[PDB]
Each structure stands twice: as structure tokens, then as C-alpha cells.
Design a protein around this nucleic acid. Structure first.
Ligand SMILES: [Zn+2]
Lengths: 75, 131, 92, 101, 184, 119, 124
RNA sequence: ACUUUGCUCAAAUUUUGGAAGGUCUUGGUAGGAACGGGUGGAUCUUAUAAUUUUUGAUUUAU
RNA sequence: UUGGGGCCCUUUGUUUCUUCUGCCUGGAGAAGUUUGACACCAAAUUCAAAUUGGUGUUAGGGGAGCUGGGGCCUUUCAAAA
RNA sequence: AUACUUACCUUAAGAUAUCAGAGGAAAGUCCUACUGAUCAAACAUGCGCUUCCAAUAGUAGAAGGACGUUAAGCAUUUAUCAUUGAACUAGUUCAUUGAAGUCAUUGAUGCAAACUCCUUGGUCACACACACGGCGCGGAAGGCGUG
């Protein structure tokens, strides 16, 4: 019905937690009413910052159902 | 067979009132639990150490005083020198107790076992007290 | 419904969150929608295992929210008036 | 064609079609023919029963229900059976329902 | 639908996130609502508890023990008096609400890090928020970069001596009459 | 057709509402909401004992059961008795209705006939 | 303890102190004020009680005394998704007659407001 | 079953319903009736069993 | 009308229905009661009133009248046995 | 409050108890302050209906709390990972480099008691009355029934 308001967030590098365990960081591109969020330059954060972190793809889309909290690390 | 005074009148349910009264006498007795209460028929014990049955009416004459009966007379007195004229207190009040002028009715069932005429006499003199 | 309208009435005030993941986000509420998804400002975060951090801005999905703690003085707020008298609506 | 365009009666004809011609026709043909059905829930135990009624959400009213549930701890198994005369089953728990021969 | 704003009591037709967001931020709605919670908040202090009294029958002992104790006199002000004294007391409570002694900020005014901490606009925790807290400013400073190199000697006819500690108005006659030394 | 409209005619009957937790509720039934929210009156709600040489029961259902305030201290097994429990609809798994009532009278929906009688 | 009206729905009961059960095994006790279509409700002064993992072994079948760790959180708004069942703890600070009185006085005052507003708008 | 005649050993009673008066007890005591709407809020039916609440990923499992 | 006694005065802003007067050697007196009055909160100026926007109070007890309901008694009537 | 300027935007749909019978405009619909049954709400009103409503013939007691003290109470269990070098048994100590790292160890878990303090109630009337388990006036909360 109503579109979520991410309007200040887009183009800013954002960390968001996928399900319980995972945390993905990427530059937010677009979003929809289900809060499906597509972002680019995705990286999967882990305990060891440079080591266990591995990039996903040039463009990644996320189902809004697996989104828990969304924090922007940015202005 | 024992007689009390100035007990709380306010609980209106005999099985709840015997819960309260029994609760003040013996903490951690059989019945702090409240699944059930025993009911011996006229002619088993309520609590250990002498207690057998409890009797309360609602009548304006008997209002505040409720009577207790015991297994035997020496245990009935043994309850009295348990406190030895050191007044226990039920809910709000110290009670003043004494020996009952009339013998315990369920104690008569134990005595004569060791009683139809009494039940006839009670119906007759009750019929006359109605007059 | 009234429960969501009270959340809209809590904008600009410090609120607490419990996500169904077990975390706790306490901080100032910037935005809220009718889908109960809210975004908070200058918030202190408590992980499910107790580790506490601080983040400047957060957006959470309403489906993952469990309870929201709202400043107590909103209890007497006009939403809870049972018998209330509204004027006639404008004709458009 | 989406459902919000249709009128009040077109939804009734749509549900009549879906029950008569469709997947749930397996249950419907099972209700009329008095054929016992096997139902697996997501709770992981299975009822052998007979369907007196069913519905869109798949919740269904049953008669002579026989529930079969096994449990194991450290690979020690026991099979338990529980009989019921009549039952009402909410449809979200079920996964597979088969029609016995 | 229509969004009824019960603070302003005025309807707004066909609620939308834009129009509703504009109304809620509106100045008039702001004043109305803020005043509303000012009243609803002043009421709980204004409302008297009026707890119920349970009177028991005084016993024969304490009536005799309390009869030998003499009866104390009670003082009751006139209506014209009690109105004024209630006004004064309430205005004193409002005073104790707003006091918030800051003197520490007055002490460190010339400290080398005074600009990074007590200015509170340029801080870290609260710094970024104040910018978004600035009003829309529709129509009609102390930068952080300061160093110790400014004001090298804190006293060159610059500072005012520390303000004297306050005193209660009631007991103001309690003060020692004369000082120990001669001030200019 | 909404089969929940059947449950609304089961009012004032002894019933067991067997939930997703495994918790079972015996009680007298009152009005059932269209979302299948089921409100009961005098209820004894408990958990079954899987035997299997001490298989730990549901850990969440024991806590939720003690936290109703209706579990009495001296109960040996795991049960609670209380008045007026209101149950959300999505929590229900099975409903065991009494053997006495006849379905042929109650399973007739008046809207289903009303649609056919009118056409 | 407390006898709830034999037929009473969630709308009939307001301001009663309730006891709310969630999916996670914790309880929110407090006065209900509002609720909603999907049954997410608003509690006034509420305290969440929790049975720790260490006390839980005490509830398994054999007078039990459970230490229930609880924390106080005022004026919350629950979510209908989490709610499991609801029970009544106490009855409101006011009787039924008194609530009828305050309801009638509140309604009369509400009408007086509409008249004072209408006649303040009309003449000026 | 009803009526009349022979022999022997309209009046009164009860239940239900209506009218009046008396007594006891309790409640109300300033708004109420009718009519009317491009009126509010509650409830119900359908969109609506398809990611944001009610047609299932928290009985911790192999 | 006076006197004596009892209990209460936390009614804490000394009976809390307002306003004004007033009180412990006392329990009082005056005016007023919903298209109104009173209290209070907020402002910016003027410069102590009002202005505009808001929240709240207008209560309790008894009796007479009138009116609704219930139980009982007596009388009148209709039906049935 | 009025006038002007600018910005933001506009109607999910339907319905208001059910069933049955008689009537008005072969099928169906609508309607009848029409007739019956059932259901629901409000208002009254009753039940030898059920439960509860605290000491003053005394310095008490009941329910519920403390996000109170004793209290560092008593009894337990815990304090990061990776790389390089030295010594060492055949894992251990020290030093250096990197990563993250809720605070607490007077903690956390279990066990129990004592004390202190808060909120609440008709702290009503009659009665101090040898019974076989009532029929004082009210208030609170229910169940059942009639109108
Ligand atoms: Zn507004």
C-alpha cells in the first residue's frame, strides 16, 4: 500500500542484517513496497573484517522478508 | 470438645473459614493446599496433633464463637496447655477459649463405639425449641 | 487502529524497541508508518547477548518488532477518550 | 485475471470452479465418495480420517480421526496412536493429503 | 478515509503521508498540541489524591491516654491569604524546575577544549543531531577550531570574579551581619 | 465458504483446543471470532507427557503455562486451571468437539443455500 | 480470585489488568487500554515476567517456588503477531456504577464542547 | 356423549387473564418523539490463505 | 433557644459545588449555579486589566411532588373444570 | 477571524439479526411501527442463588508489592583469538606484531532468612450471646430467571 521511506538512505553505504546471523553491507540502489532492497558492491561482513569478508556481486537484490534492521553508516 | 470466642465472623464459607482457622492454628499443616476438605458424617481427622472436626453456625446467637472437637479429652486439653494461657491470635484477634459445657457430638460417636436415642431426642427438643 | 496512532503520536520522543531477534534499540523515533516499520535517530543498541553499541540512524522492519515502549505521558492522550464529540466533516 | 476486478457473484463461480475443477477437487471427490484420506501435518504426525467438510484455507471437519505419532530420543523409537471421533482441523498445519484407494 | 486530528479538532481530508506530515509539523498544530500536554501534565500535580478514610473505633485505653494530652492549636489562613500563598508556592516550584546549575560551564570557559565539549553543537554524540534539530527557519558561534594560542593569559582585565553563592529569601536574616575582611 | 462460520454455532459446548505449542485446552466455548479467535470460560489447559524415558517437553510451553498464574503449586503433573482464557486464532492447531452433536444439522451453511435459492 | 463475565469479549474488558502470553514464553501484565483488528494491544503500566533457563528445570514434573526475572516497562504497544493468549488478572480501580457515572459526565461535557465551539464559530 | 323419568345414599370451590383501590419496596426526575441526510464511530461480508500481524519455519529435531 | 455528653475535623488550600469574608476560646456568614460562571496553562506585547488559543470544575445528602418497575391484600369482570 | 500568494493532496465496495408463514407490486426480487419462532442489546426487576468485604475487649492482622536493606550474606562457576622469536616436556612460561573486545568479579548463578518501608479494604450495625451447622443494612464481583 504505502512505500517505505528510505529516500534519505539511497546511494549511501548501508549495513543491514540478513536473517539472524548474516550482515550485508552495500550501497543502496532501490527499494519497493515489500522493502525488497537492491544494492550494488555487496560485501558479506564476518568476524574477521578483511579476511572472512567476501564480495557477492555487482548487483544484489534482497527480499524484504529477510530484512530485520537497516542502519546506514554514512551521513 | 473445646469452646472459643471473638473469632472472625467475616468469611461466609464454612470450608474457607475452617481453612483460615486451621491455617492460624497449624502453619504447614495438611491443608494449606486446598484440593479438598474432609467431612466426617455423624456417627478420620482434620489435622494431626488432636484436631478432628470444626463447627460453625451463622446464627446471630452463635455469631463469633466457633467450637472445636478433638480426638480425646486429654489431647483436647493438651491443645489448651500447648499455649498454656498464652493467647494465640487468629486473623485480627487474640482468642479466649475454654472447655465446652456440652460434650463433643462426634466424640459421643467415639465414646459409645467404645446412638439413635440421641438423634430422636435432638429432633424432639429441636421441635420444642421451635415452639 | 489506536495502537498504531499512538506510535504516530510518539514521533520525536525517546522510545524503546524489542525486535523478535532479541535485540533492544532504545533511542529517538524519527519516522513511523502504518506498517509499524519505524526509523530511529541516535540510538543505543543491545545485542541479544548483551553487547551494547551506538549507531546514529536505524531503520527496522515492522514485522520484526515485538514491543515498543513509549513515553508514559502519552497515556492520557486524546486517542483514549471513549466518548468524544467530533464536528461535521467538510464536504468535498 | 486479478481478483479485485471481479464482482460478488464472479468470486462465487470462481470458488465453485476451484473446488469442482482444481487441486482441491482431490478432497472434494474424497468427501462425496466416503473415501478415507491420509493427512500429514507440519507437526510431523499423520491422521487417517474421513472428511465431512473442507474449505478454501484447507481447514476441514473430520469424522473417525486416527492420529499416528512416533517419537525418538537417541535413536529409541516408540509409535503412539490416538483415536478421535470427530475433529476440526485448521488448514495451515497440513502439507500433503492423499486419497486412499 | 479522512484523518481527524483531535488536538486541533480539525479534519484533514484523504490522509496522505505528505499532507499529514505537513500538518503534524505545522506551527499551529504544534502550539495546540504542546499546550494540550502542558495542561494534561499540570493536572496530575493539580489533582488532589483524595484517598479514602477508614475510621476505626478508638479504644478505651488510647482515649484515656490521649485525653490527658492537651489539645494543640491549629492555624488556618484567610481565603485572601491562602490564594496568594498558593500562588507563591506554585511559582516557587516552577522556579526549582528550571534551575539546573551550570556553574561548571562558567568555570572552564577558557579551557583549551572548551569548544569541543560545552558548546554542544560541535560535539560528537549530540553534534550532528542539532543540525537536523534546527527549525525550518522559513522567512525573516564558537567554532571548534579554536586553540590555546588565543587568550594565552586568561587574566588581562578580562574575567569577572565568580558569582556569590545564593541564599534563601526566607532565612536571609540568618547571614552573619558583618564580613571578616574589608572588600573594596 | 468460510468454515469458521461452523465454529460459531458450536457455542456453549465442551471442547479441547489443541494449540501449536502442544498445549491442550479443555473448556466451555464462547463466541468464536471470524479470525478463529476462540474465547473460553472454565478451562484446564495442560501439556502432554512424552514418555520415552524422560524426553524433555516443550520448554516454552512450560514457561507460558506457569506464567498464566493459574498453575497451582501442589500440582504434581503439569497442568493449570483458570477462568476466561482468550486465544488468538493463528495459535490453534486441532479442535476436538464433542461426540454428541450431529454435523448434518450444523454443517449446513445458510449463505450456501441462500446463493442457490436466489439464483 | 476474580470472576470475569461469562460472556465478555476483548472490547467489553478495558482498564482491567491483564496477563498477556507471547510466543517466546514471556508475559506482559498490565492495564489494557486499546486493541486492534489484528489484536495488537496497548498496556499502561506493564511488567514483563520471564522464567530463566536455570529455573525452568524446576517446572518439569516430579510446593514449587519459581524465581521469575521481570522488568518494568510502561505504556507499551504490543504486536498482534507475537501474542498467544490473554488472561485476566484483576478488575479496574473503578466499579461498574462509577464508570457509568464518569461515562455520562464525559459525554455531557463532550456535547457542551460542541455547542461552545459551534456558537463561538457562528457569530464571529 | 347429551337430555328426560324413577329408586337409593341457580348456588358454592379452584386455575388462568383483565380493571380499580390499599400497603410495602425500588428506580427515575430534564429532556424525549417523529422526520431527514453526498453524517461520525462500532459490527459483519468480500477483495484478503502470496514478503509488514489471523490459514504457520521458535515442541530443536536429522 | 440554651446547656451537657459522644464521635469527626488529614477537611492537611480546615468540608473540596464555586467566588468573596472568615475560623481552633470553632463547625460560620454573603452572593451564584450550564446557551452561564469559576479555576488554571500558554504566549507576545502593551506595560499589572483584558486580548487570543487550550485543559478542567459546576458536587454530595434528605424530603415533598410527578413518573417507571416489582411483590402482597381486597373488590369487579371473562374462560375452563 | 478576514483578504492575497505558494506548496501538498482528493470517495475500496456492500450491508445492519435469522428462520418460517400470510399479503401487495410459473420465476426470482422488493416491501408489509404484518403474524409466529429463535437470537442479540439496553433497561428494569427478582430470587432463603455463589464468593468477598480488617484489631480496638487492642499496639494487631489479610492481599499485593519494594525497579528496599542486611549484603563484598552463604554455596558455586567464570575472564579473549591469530602470527614470530627464546626456553621447555615430547603440552607450558616470557617478549614482540595483528584482529575484534557491553559494563560488571563488591559481578553472574543457585539457596534461605530476618528486618524495614509502600498501596489497598464497610477498619458498618447489633452483639460477648453453649451449637449441629443462617434467614441485619449495605457495597464489589458473578451465575440463573421473568418483564
Ligand atoms: Zn492538528
Amino acid at each position: 500500500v504505502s512505500t517505505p521511506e528510505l529516500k534519505k538512505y539511497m546511494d549511501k553505504k548501508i549495513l543491514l542484517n540478513i536473517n539472524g546471523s548474516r550482515k550485508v553491507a552495500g550501497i543502496l540502489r532501490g527499494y519497493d513496497i515489500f522493502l525488497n532492497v537492491v544494492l550494488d558492491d555487496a560485501m558479506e561482513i564476518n568476524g574477521e573484517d578483511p579476511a572472512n569478508n567476501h564480495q557477492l556481486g555487482l548487483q544484489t537484490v534482497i527480499r524484504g522478508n529477510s530484512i530485520i534492521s537497516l542502519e546506514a553508516l554514512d551521513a | 470438645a473445646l469452646y472459643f470466642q471473638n473469632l472472625p465472623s467475616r468469611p461466609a464459607n464454612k470450608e474457607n473459614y475452617t481453612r483460615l482457622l486451621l491455617k492460624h492454628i497449624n502453619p504447614n499443616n495438611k491443608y494449606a493446599i486446598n484440593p479438598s476438605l474432609p467431612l466426617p458424617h455423624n456417627k478420620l481427622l482434620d489435622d494431626q496433633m488432636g484436631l478432628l472436626e470444626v463447627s460453625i453456625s451463622r446464627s446471630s446467637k452463635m455469631t463469633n464463637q466457633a467450637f472445636l472437637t478433638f480426638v480425646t479429652q486429654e489431647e483436647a486439653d493438651r491443645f489448651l496447655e500447648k499455649y498454656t494461657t498464652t493467647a494465640l491470635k487468629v486473623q485480627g484477634r487474640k482468642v479466649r477459649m475454654g472447655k465446652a459445657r456440652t460434650n463433643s457430638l462426634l466424640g459421643l460417636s467415639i465414646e459409645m463405639q467404645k446412638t439413635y436415642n440421641l438423634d430422636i431426642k435432638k429432633v424432639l427438643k429441636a421441635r420444642k425449641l421451635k415452639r | 487502529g489506536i495502537p498504531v496512532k499512538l506510535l504516530n503520536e510518539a514521533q520525536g520522543h525517546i522510545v524503546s524497541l524489542e525486535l523478535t531477534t532479541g535485540a533492544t534499540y532504545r533511542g529517538k523515533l524519527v519516522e513511523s508508518e502504518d506498517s509499524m516499520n519505524v526509523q530511529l535517530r541516535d540510538v543505543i543498541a543491545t545485542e541479544p547477548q548483551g553487547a551494547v553499541t551506538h549507531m546514529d540512524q536505524i531503520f527496522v522492519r515492522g514485522s520484526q518488532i515485538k514491543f515498543i515502549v513509549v513515553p508514559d505521558l502519552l497515556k492520557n492522550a486524546p486517542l483514549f477518550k471513549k466518548n468524544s464529540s467530533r464536528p461535521m466533516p467538510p464536504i468535498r | 485475471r486479478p481478483k479485485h476486478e471481479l464482482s460478488r457473484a464472479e468470486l462465487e463461480e470462481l470458488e465453485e470452479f476451484e473446488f469442482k475443477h482444481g487441486p482441491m477437487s482431490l478432497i472434494n471427490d474424497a468427501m462425496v465418495t466416503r473415501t478415507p484420506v491420509i493427512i500429514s501435518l507440519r507437526n510431523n504426525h499423520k491422521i487417517i480420517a474421513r472428511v465431512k467438510a473442507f474449505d478454501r484455507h484447507c481447514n476441514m471437519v473430520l469424522e473417525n480421526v486416527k492420529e499416528l505419532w512416533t517419537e525418538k530420543k537417541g535413536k529409541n523409537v516408540i509409535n503412539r496412536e490416538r483415536f478421535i471421533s470427530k475433529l476440526f482441523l485448521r488448514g495451515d498445519s497440513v502439507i500433503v493429503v492423499l486419497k486412499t484407494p | 478515509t479522512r484523518y481527524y486530528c483531535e488536538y486541533c479538532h480539525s479534519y484533514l481530508t484523504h490522509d496522505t503521508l505528505s499532507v499529514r506530515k505537513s500538518h503534524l509539523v505545522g506551527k499551529n498544530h504544534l502550539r495546540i498540541t504542546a499546550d494540550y500536554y502542558r495542561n494534561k501534565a499540570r493536572d496530575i500535580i493539580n489533582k488532589h489524591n483524595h484517598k479514602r478514610r477508614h475510621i476505626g473505633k478508638r479504644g478505651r485505653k488510647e482515649r484515656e491516654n490521649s485525653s490527658q494530652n492537651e489539645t494543640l492549636k491549629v492555624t488556618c489562613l484567610s481565603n485572601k491569604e491562602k490564594r496568594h500563598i498558593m500562588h507563591v508556592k506554585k511559582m516557587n516550584q516552577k522556579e526549582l524546575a528550571q534551575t539546573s546549575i551550570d556553574t561548571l560551564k562558567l568555570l572552564y570557559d577558557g579551557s583549551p577544549g572548551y569548544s569541543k565539549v560545552f558548546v554542544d553543537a560541535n560535539r560528537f554524540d549530540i553534534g550532528d543531531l542539532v543540525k537536523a534539530s534546527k527549525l525550518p527557519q522559513r522567512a525573516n558561534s564558537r567554532s571548534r577550531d579554536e586553540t590555546c594560542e588565543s587568550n594565552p593569559f586568561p587574566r588581562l582585565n578580562n574575567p569577572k570574579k565568580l558569582e556569590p553563592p545564593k541564599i534563601l529569601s526566607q532565612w536571609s536574616n540568618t547571614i552573619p551581619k558583618t564580613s571578616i575582611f574589608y572588600s573594596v | 465458504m468460510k468454515l469458521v462460520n461452523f465454529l460459531k454455532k458450536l457455542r456453549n459446548e465442551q471442547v479441547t483446543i489443541e494449540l501449536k505449542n502442544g498445549t491442550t485446552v479443555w473448556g466451555t466455548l464462547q463466541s468464536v471470532s471470524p479470525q478463529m479467535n476462540a474465547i473460553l470460560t472454565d478451562v484446564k489447559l495442560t501439556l502432554p507427557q512424552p514418555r520415552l524415558n524422560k524426553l524433555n517437553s516443550n520448554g516454552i510451553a512450560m514457561a507460558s503455562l506457569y506464567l498464566t498464574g493459574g498453575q497451582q503449586p501442589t500440582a504434581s503433573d503439569n497442568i493449570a486451571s483458570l477462568q476466561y482464557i482468550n486465544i488468538r486464532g493463528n495459535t490453534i492447531r486441532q479442535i476436538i468437539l464433542p461426540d454428541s452433536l450431529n454435523l448434518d444439522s450444523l454443517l449446513v451453511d445458510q449463505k450456501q443455500l441462500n446463493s442457490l435459492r436466489r439464483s | 480470585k476474580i470472576q470475569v463475565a461469562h460472556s465478555s469479549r476483548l472490547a467489553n474488558l478495558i482498564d482491567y489488568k491483564l496477563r498477556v502470553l507471547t510466543q517466546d514464553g514471556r508475559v506482559y501484565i498490565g492495564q489494557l487500554m486499546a486493541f486492534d483488528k489484528h489484536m495488537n494491544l496497548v498496556l499502561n503500566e506493564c511488567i514483563e515476567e520471564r522464567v530463566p533457563k536455570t529455573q525452568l528445570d524446576k517446572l518439569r514434573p516430579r510446593t514449587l517456588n519459581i524465581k521469575v526475572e521481570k522488568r518494568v516497562l510502561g505504556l507499551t504497544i504490543l504486536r498482534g503477531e507475537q501474542i498467544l493468549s490473554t488472561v485476566v488478572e484483576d478488575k479496574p480501580l473503578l466499579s461498574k456504577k462509577e464508570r457509568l457515572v464518569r461515562d455520562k459526565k464525559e459525554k455531557k461535557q463532550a456535547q457542551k464542547q460542541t455547542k461552545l465551539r459551534k456558537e463561538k464559530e457562528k457569530k464571529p
